[PDB]
């Protein structure tokens, strides 16, 4: 029993408008450098599709995540320690730049400096950002399949179409599309950490963010393969790997992430989750993969239970963090209402970024239809997005939790319509799904109104505990190069000292 805190994220896919604002703001701030210009910490994919990098969901090809041996023990699909080491001179599974897209630029200057007397209007052609050579034609991009862009036979190669008869969906009338914005999962049992030989990747104790130490990373590039979600990107110029850092610089002060605060859809939720670190192995190594979901919900602790509260305090969790957990929207959607579900729980990483499945227009029927259990509003059965598809994506293939989520969402709508249109109280749909009037009005508050102060409940990382805040406040930022940051031993070959430190010790004790 080791209680730890982490700020989880829940994205309401029902409200996602496939706009990509989240991706652009992240790109502007974190990855506009040469070397990671092709990396999209946050990226959105239109589904059906093979995503970015192409077919990242195909673990048979890419080798990501964990597998459970026959003896019940956990091992990276890449191989045990020795196996992984034997693949170091050349990652036989490593995805190539082409699997992403060759980053390109344009010669806008030609528009400007085009000489006098051109036989044809000048133009800006594409240039490779890797080679710098002229590009014959742009043939791929990170969001190339956006909005069903591409033959059905090509998109339907989506791994989530397995065990589904997909013929019927190539028919115009049955067309369906949804968006899947994604960042790094910040797993509880991250495979990346387990696949890095140099041990440069780690999970932060205070907020559970997983970071790749740029000083320590040696560029063995095995981590990129270990990550089943393919969210670690090799920086081809620096030689080290880089990944979404969960905007720790803002989260530390208690602010939302950039992609959270900038989400035009108001679909992202940030809240604290308390989990039992000691249960991690147990949960992730459960025999049936269809259990990983439930098994993970069991690692999360109730922030209101004084038993948990007392243990959290005993375990180093600041009081503000605990209070934040107590009003966390992530906890309400994953634990209470059961609307949020993990992304690909079958990788056994215990992902920390969950999703609320999307609703969709009713499917095509012979006639104009009838009034179902929810009146003019839809019945879960009539939804056009095949639920099995959503389950291969959110619940390792089990349609039960997905349907419960969809049905409650629909349940709420029906209850809310009676109240605001008929002016009556009708809980018939809520009883059928197991919700109360109270839980519904709250669901409504958080999902419909979604005030800023409700979508984001992020506590400070308390950068003052176990450290020396005062001298830091006074001397941080002055980067003249003292050559003493990064080590705990004061001795250094350049005969120098830390600027943000006190070297004249008190003699008065």
């Amino acid at each position: 029993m080791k209680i730890r805190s982490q700020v989880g994220m829940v994205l309401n896919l029902d409200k996602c408008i496939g706009c990509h604002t989240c991706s652009v703001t992240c790109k502007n701030v974190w990855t506009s450098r040469e070397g990671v210009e092709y990396a999209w910490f946050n990226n959105v994919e239109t589904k059906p599709g093979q995503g970015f990098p192409t077919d990242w969901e195909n673990q048979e090809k890419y080798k990501g995540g964990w597998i459970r041996k026959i003896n019940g023990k956990l091992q990276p699909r890449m191989g045990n320690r020795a196996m992984l080491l034997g693949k170091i001179f050349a990652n036989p599974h490593l995805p190539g730049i082409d699997d992403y897209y060759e980053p390109f630029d344009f010669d806008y200057q030609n528009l400007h400096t085009a000489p006098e007397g051109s036989k044809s209007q000048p133009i800006a052609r594409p240039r490779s950002l890797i080679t710098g050579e002229r590009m014959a034609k742009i043939e791929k991009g990170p969001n190339w399949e956006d909005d069903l862009g591409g033959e059905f036979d090509k998109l339907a190669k989506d791994k989530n179409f397995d065990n589904i008869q997909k013929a019927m969906y190539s028919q115009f009338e049955n067309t369906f599309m949804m968006y899947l914005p994604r960042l790094c999962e910040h797993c509880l049992n991250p495979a990346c950490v387990a696949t890095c030989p140099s041990g440069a990747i780690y999970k932060r104790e205070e907020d559970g963010i997983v970071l790749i130490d740029q000083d320590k990373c040696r560029g063995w590039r095995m981590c990129i393969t270990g990550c089943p979600y393919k969210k670690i990107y090799f920086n081809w110029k620096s030689g080290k790997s880089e990944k979404c850092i969960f905007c720790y610089p803002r989260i530390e002060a208690g602010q939302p992430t950039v992609c959270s605060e900038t989400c035009v859809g108001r679909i992202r939720y940030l809240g604290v989750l308390l989990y039992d670190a000691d249960a991690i192995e147990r949960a992730a190594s459960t025999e049936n993969e269809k259990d990983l979901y439930q098994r993970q919900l069991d690692v999360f602790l109730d922030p209101n239970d004084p038993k948990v509260i007392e243990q959290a305090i005993k375990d180093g969790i600041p009081l503000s963090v605990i209070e934040a957990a107590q009003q966390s929207p992530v906890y309400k959607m994953a634990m209470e209402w059961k609307l949020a579900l993990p992304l690909h729980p079958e990788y056994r990483t215990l992902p920390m970024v969950w999703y609320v499945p999307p609703l969709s227009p009713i499917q095509s029927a012979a006639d104009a239809g009838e009034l179902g259990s929810n009146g003019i509003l839809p019945d879960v059965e009539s939804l056009r997005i095949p639920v099995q598809y959503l389950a291969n994506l959110l619940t390792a293939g089990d349609t039960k939790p997905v349907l419960r989520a969809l049905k409650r969402m629909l349940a709420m709508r029906h209850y809310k319509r009676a109240e605001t249109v008929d002016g009556k109280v009708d809980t018939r749909a809520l009883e059928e799904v197991g919700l109360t009037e109270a839980q519904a009005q709250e669901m409504y508050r958080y999902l419909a109104i979604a005030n800023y102060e409700d979508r984001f409940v992020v506590p400070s990382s308390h950068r003052e505990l176990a450290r020396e805040a005062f001298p830091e406040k006074n001397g941080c930022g002055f980067t003249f190069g003292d050559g003493c940051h990064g080590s705990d031993t004061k001795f250094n070959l350049f005969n120098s000292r830390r600027i943000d430190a006190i070297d004249v010790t008190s003699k008065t004790e």
Binding site: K15, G18, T21, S23, V24, L74, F106, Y108, Q109, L111, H112, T113, A114, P115, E116, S120, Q121, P122, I123, A124, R125, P126, R134, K137, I138, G141, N143, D147, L148, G150, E151, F152, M177, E205, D213, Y248, P249, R250, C263, V264, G265, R266, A277, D278, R282, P358, L359, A368, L377, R413, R417, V421, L447, I449, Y452, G477, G486, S487, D488, T489
Partner: protein, 1244 residues
């Protein structure tokens, strides 16, 4: 020492966890500052974007290392009510990428000039000390003028200086004004709401010198002619927050999540409130993904569905089981109870004009504007002329309201709807029907061009002796929809499955949407509207408004909303969202932009007619007014080319002109003095004698075409320019890619109002100046490029239709390199102008024509018929049957002083708009303390305007929307007209004054104003028409009510008096060229649609690398899998698209969500990035508008008639484009034309 630390290996090991699966290390983490220091910045500045998107989102500009690095949304908007979601964060992906521009390789850093023009300018100045003359030496020479006009779009830019270009520009303008007239100088800049002051900078300079300001709302086709038609209002809609008040919504031709991004959450969240959503799009669009039902009718056929639904509604909620709410509503707010006179035909009658109080004997007591007041019957048979009709707006006060009272006795008198149950006899009236016509790509339903219905009528004794028959609009409406009322009509339906005039079964054939689906939604929509008292809404966009018959598509949707009494009801109504046209502080901005504080009036021009003519696109017209004529119209009365109708409308004072007169307007005064008569009467006489002609009649005589054009905040020649190839050939005089012949080469019939000549005049424009921060397509084809400042480097204001906040644009840093703000550029030009014009122009007298203005007194021009003074059908009475003729004084040498100061007219005359006028002196006193005043000179003592802020402050102080003091005087002025008290709509905000620095700190909500019909309260959201319905304020229409029947002559004869399905027209731009220049690959004719793109706002951001990387990396076209596979086109293949008008090249996007039969090139991807050479034209591939062409509609030219009177952006021809067909085919040779040697070849 990091090296020595490794020796503390074991010492840093803490406890394990998870039974040996994890290890807690106590290692150094200082390396983490790496990302921390990246996020840290110098400061954040607030600002928004000056682009046409309606977003108007406040952003945080992050400055780091003295450079703008990135940006995120501001989340501090004043929160909405507790029950409605708040706006934050708003924004979109496009906006989030703006920062990329500031230092990108495509940033315009210095004023540029075309090398050939510079070489000849510098040699001309070495021979002509004076600049005007140096310009004359170049322009008046053919070989010279030609040399730089053919260089356009052909490289050769060289760095210049503000000094050199300002002189050349001022020189060129002086020459042009002194030798042809001020109206030969124009400027095109759109949507002022997105940067009120940046637009105003050019508009002001041009107005001061008498130049013309070209419109945009109609030019872009964002203007829904139906709005003016039905409400006499340009556009007024509820705010996005209001959507959350609706319990039923239909997104019709509106890709909300993609084109209204920042507001999309109101739509996704209202779903959780129990609201049902329906998406109506032919393709599976993003909007579909967020709805409960998806209907995919055939594109263009939408009016069909609308008619059928209107049918079901009228049948089940107005006839069978009536609705108390619906009935009272239409009774009190529509013209349905109004009487229509029946004309005579052969065995049948036809709907004529509406019955006016003047027709009756006693004239109904109404002796003031009797011919302008409608009539109806009360519940007691007694006839009456109820209050509200446009007849009471002028010449009297206290009766222009929607109170249900008798216009004569001022008594409570209920009006009656149907005559049925009191009709003397049953007349048979003929209605037109076009559902049977159309091209081969749309289904048709043969019935009869004319449908006879049995209408209940009454015979009345007209005051002039004779007698005629009358019937209510309500009756004709039920007849028009085909509702069987028991008189046994053969053309009326007996069941919904009966295929008659507008039934579900009927529309299923035309649209392809199951009849049951239509019946259901119509029933649900109407039911909801009943249960909630109008809380049903329809969000419509360019999906419908960009078709030649946008009017029908809209009136279709509008009648539905009215039959359910949704308009003027919070949570219901007509939500028209296209461009950002709601510049809220209207009346405080107009005097600034058009210098109405100094001179009156200014030269406004409707762009469509303007370009149609000067771009000479009329010389290729395929559509004939004849084929638009109603079957019941006298064909011989409407002969001539479409442009002939425009010219007539212009001389009848209906639409504006530019250039106005075929003679320099600055000289008319100098000739009227010698002739001994005053300038006005000397012009009326000369126009009658034909000594002075309207320039429109002779557009190519060498003196009636524009010569100087300023383009700013627009990419005209690369985006909005319909007929791109025609503009390149005629306005620019450069190589073009037009494929067809003209009326002359085909031997078609020439216009009967305009001179024809075989060889059209090319290169009309002498000087084209474009102001931009990036090198756009327009810039590439300009003569002089002025580097303007980005939105993050200048101060300005922004407002939108979606919300009531007026936030700013600010400078995070000073403009980079040699850039300047639009305002500083025009100020400098006004300065250089004032000194270069010395000895050429002095204090001149100018004659200015002005069309009969809407909202003015003159809008009651021609009440009963259409008299052309030129055909002798009446006298030339300016202001009534011809344009007004104004005398404007211009102190050319004082241009710069006036530009930089608030003129005296605000104090002398006053200020106002939309019919009312108030005193604004106290505001000027306040403005003298804020902006300070001029020390001396011509503007001594007047408030200053040296900076953008001074200007912004002028706008905020004079506008009733941002100054509660003015807001009270504004509601007072309107209370005079209505006779009802409205001051209570602003009283409790009277001490409210918005300041520029106040909104820089936090966006502020505006004050309720008569300029709009929605309210700014804390209990009810802003809903269009709310005032009309809740304040009994009339709609600026003929009847004062919502017009369902258009009785104007031209309307009746063009079959538009009542809504009727009108299939998509045939432009005939494919059959004459398909197969001609074969390349070996199959070609096919597809409907070319251009909805707005996801990776740019029009063409802005289209060159932006973030947008290009998130898209396909350049221009692309979407095709269905069938169409593609049938042409042998794989995804991303280079393809060609073309027709009579031109050709464009792009890569293909093959997708299942595109229905067979259509192709889509999302609007604006322009002509500067990733475009190979065309095989059809042998030139750089063209743009999407390289295959479109302007084609005007007559009904869009009606002027001088109440709600159908002119107004800048209010009415006028629109530039529709969705009816276009193109030829698609895979390319073979991919030639880049750059001499690089990197060309490709596609096989098969």
């Amino acid at each position: 020492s990091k090296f020595l630390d490794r020796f503390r290996y074991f010492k840093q090991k803490g406890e394990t966890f998870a039974d040996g699966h994890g290890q807690l290390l106590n290692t150094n983490r200082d390396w983490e500052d790496g990302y921390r220091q990246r996020w840290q910045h110098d400061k954040i500045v607030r600002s928004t974007h000056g682009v046409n998107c309606t977003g108007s989102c406040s952003w945080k500009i992050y400055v780091k290392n003295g450079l703008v690095t990135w940006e995120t949304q501001q989340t501090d908007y004043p929160r909405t009510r507790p029950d409605l979601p708040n706006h934050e964060p708003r924004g979109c992906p496009r906006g989030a990428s703006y920062s990329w521009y500031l230092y990108s390789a495509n940033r315009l850093k210095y004023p540029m000039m075309r090398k050939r023009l510079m070489k000849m300018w510098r040699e001309a100045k070495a021979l002509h000390s004076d600049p005007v003359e140096a310009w004359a030496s170049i322009i008046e020479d053919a070989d010279k003028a030609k040399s730089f006009k053919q260089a356009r779009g052909r490289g050769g830019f060289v760095r210049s200086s503000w000094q050199e270009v300002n002189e050349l520009i001022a020189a060129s303008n002086v020459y042009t004004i002194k030798n042809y007239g001020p109206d030969r100088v124009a400027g095109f800049s759109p949507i002022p709401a997105m940067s009120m002051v940046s637009y105003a900078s050019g508009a002001r300079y041009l107005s001061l010198i008498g130049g013309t300001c070209l419109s945009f709302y109609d030019w872009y086709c964002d203007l829904p002619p139906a709005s003016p038609q039905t409400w006499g209002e340009q556009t007024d809609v509820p705010e996005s927050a209001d959507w959350y008040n609706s319990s039923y919504i239909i997104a019709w031709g509106s890709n909300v999540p993609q084109t209204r991004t920042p507001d999309a959450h109101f739509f996704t969240e209202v779903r959780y409130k129990g609201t049902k959503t329906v998406a109506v799009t032919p393709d599976y669009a993003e909007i579909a993904k967020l709805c409960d039902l998806w209907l995919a009718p055939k594109q263009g056929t939408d009016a069909a569905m609308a008619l059928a639904m209107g049918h079901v509604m009228l049948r089940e909620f107005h006839l069978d089981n009536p609705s108390q709410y619906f009935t009272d509503y239409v009774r009190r707010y529509t013209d349905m109870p109004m009487l229509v006179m029946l004309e005579e035909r052969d065995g049948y009658y036809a709907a004529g004009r509406m019955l006016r109080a003047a027709d009756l004997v006693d004239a109904l007591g109404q002796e003031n504007n009797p011919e302008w007041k409608t009539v109806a019957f009360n519940t007691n048979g007694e006839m009456v002329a109820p209050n509200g009709s446009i007849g009471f707006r002028w010449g009297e006060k206290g009766k222009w309201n929607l109170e249900q009272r008798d216009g004569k006795t001022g008594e409570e008198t209920e009006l009656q709807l149907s005559l049925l149950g009191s009709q003397d006899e049953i007349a048979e009236v003929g209605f037109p029907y076009f559902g049977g016509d159309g091209t081969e790509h749309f289904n048709k339903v043969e019935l009869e061009n004319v449908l006879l219905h049995k209408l209940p009528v009454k015979r009345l004794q007209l005051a002039d002796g004779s007698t005629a028959l009358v019937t209510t609009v309500y009756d004709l409406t039920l007849a028009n929809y085909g509702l069987e009322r028991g008189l046994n009509d053969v053309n009326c339906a007996t069941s919904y499955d009966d295929v008659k005039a507008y039934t579900p079964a009927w529309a299923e054939q035309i649209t392809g949407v199951s009849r049951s689906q239509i019946i259901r939604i119509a029933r649900e929509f109407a039911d909801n509207a009943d249960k909630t008292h109008g809380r049903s809404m329809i969000i419509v966009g360019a999906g419908l408004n960009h078709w030649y018959h946008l009017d029908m598509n809209y009136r279709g949707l509008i009648n539905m909303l009215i039959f359910c009494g949704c308009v003027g009801q919070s949570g219901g109504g007509w939500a028209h969202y296209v461009g950002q046209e709601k510049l809220r502080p209207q009346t405080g901005w107009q005097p600034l932009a058009f210098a109405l504080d100094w001179q009156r009036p200014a030269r406004h021009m409707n762009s469509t007619s303007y370009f149609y003519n000067h771009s000479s696109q009329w010389r290729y017209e395929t559509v004939t007014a004849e084929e638009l004529l109603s079957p019941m119209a006298d064909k011989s009365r409407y002969t001539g080319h479409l442009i002939d109708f425009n010219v007539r409308a212009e001389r009848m004072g209906w639409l504006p002109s530019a250039p106005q007169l075929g003679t320099n307007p600055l000289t008319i005064a100098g000739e009227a003095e010698k002739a001994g008569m005053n300038p006005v009467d000397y012009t009326v006489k000369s126009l009658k004698e034909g000594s002075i002609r309207f320039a429109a009649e002779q557009p190519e005589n060498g003196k009636n075409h524009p010569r100087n054009l300023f383009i700013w905040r627009s990419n005209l020649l690369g985006s909005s320019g319909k007929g791109h190839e025609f503009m390149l050939k005629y306005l620019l005089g450069t190589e073009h890619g037009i494929q067809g012949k003209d009326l002359g080469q085909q031997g078609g019939v020439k216009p009967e109002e305009v001179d024809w000549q075989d060889n059209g005049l090319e290169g009309k424009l002498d000087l084209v100046v474009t102001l931009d921060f990036r090198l756009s397509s327009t810039c590439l084809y300009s003569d002089i490029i002025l580097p303007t400042a980005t939105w993050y480097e200048k101060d300005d204001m922004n407002t939108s239709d979606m919300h009531p906040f007026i936030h700013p644009l600010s400078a995070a840093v000073d403009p980079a390199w040699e850039a300047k703000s639009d305002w500083e550029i025009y100020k400098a030009i006004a300065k250089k102008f004032s000194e270069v014009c010395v000895g050429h122009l002095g204090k001149e007298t100018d004659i200015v024509t002005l069309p009969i203005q809407h909202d003015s007194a003159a809008e009651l021009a021609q009440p009963l018929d259409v008299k052309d003074w030129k055909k002798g059908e009446c006298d030339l009475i300016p202001g009534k049957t011809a344009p007004h003729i104004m005398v404007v004084e211009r102190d050319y040498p004082a241009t710069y002083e006036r530009f930089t100061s608030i003129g005296p007219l605000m104090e002398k005359i006053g200020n106002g708009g939309k019919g009312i006028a108030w005193n604004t002196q106290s505001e000027m006193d306040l403005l003298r303390k804020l902006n300070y005043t001029k020390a001396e000179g011509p503007a001594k003592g007047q408030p200053m305007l040296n900076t953008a802020i001074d200007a912004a402050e002028m706008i905020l102080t004079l506008a009733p929307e941002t100054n509660g003091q003015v807001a009270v005087k504004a509601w007072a002025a309107l209370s005079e007209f209505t006779g009802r008290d409205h001051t209570h709509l602003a009283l409790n905000k009277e001490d409210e004054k918005i300041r520029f620095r106040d909104i820089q700190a936090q966006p502020r909500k505006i004050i309720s104003s008569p300029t709009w019909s929605g309210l700014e309260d804390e209990h009810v959201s802003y809903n269009a028409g709310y005032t009309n319905v809740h304040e009994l304020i009339p709609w600026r229409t003929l009847s004062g009510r919502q017009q369902l029947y258009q009785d104007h002559q031209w309307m009746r004869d063009f079959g538009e008096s009542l809504l009727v399905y009108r299939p998509p027209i045939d432009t005939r731009s494919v059959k004459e060229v398909i197969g001609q220049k074969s390349n070996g690959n199959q070609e096919k004719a597809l409907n070319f649609l251009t909805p707005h793109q996801k990776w740019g706002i029009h063409s802005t951001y289209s060159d932006n690398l973030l947008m290009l990387t998130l898209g396909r990396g350049g221009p692309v076209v979407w095709l269905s899998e069938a169409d593609a596979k049938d042409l042998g086109i794989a995804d991303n293949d280079w393809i060609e698209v073309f027709n009579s008008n031109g050709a464009l090249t792009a890569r293909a996007v093959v997708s299942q969500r595109v229905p067979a039969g259509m192709t889509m090139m999302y609007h604006a991807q322009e002509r500067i990035v990733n475009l190979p050479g065309s095989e059809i034209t042998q030139q750089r591939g063209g743009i999407h508008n390289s295959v479109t062409r302007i084609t005007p509609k007559p009904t869009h030219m009606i002027g001088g008639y109440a709600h159908l009177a002119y107004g800048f952006n209010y009415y006028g021809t629109v530039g529709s484009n969705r009816d276009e067909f193109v030829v698609v085919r895979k390319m073979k040779n991919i030639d880049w034309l750059d001499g690089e040697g990197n060309d490709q070849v596609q096989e098969s």
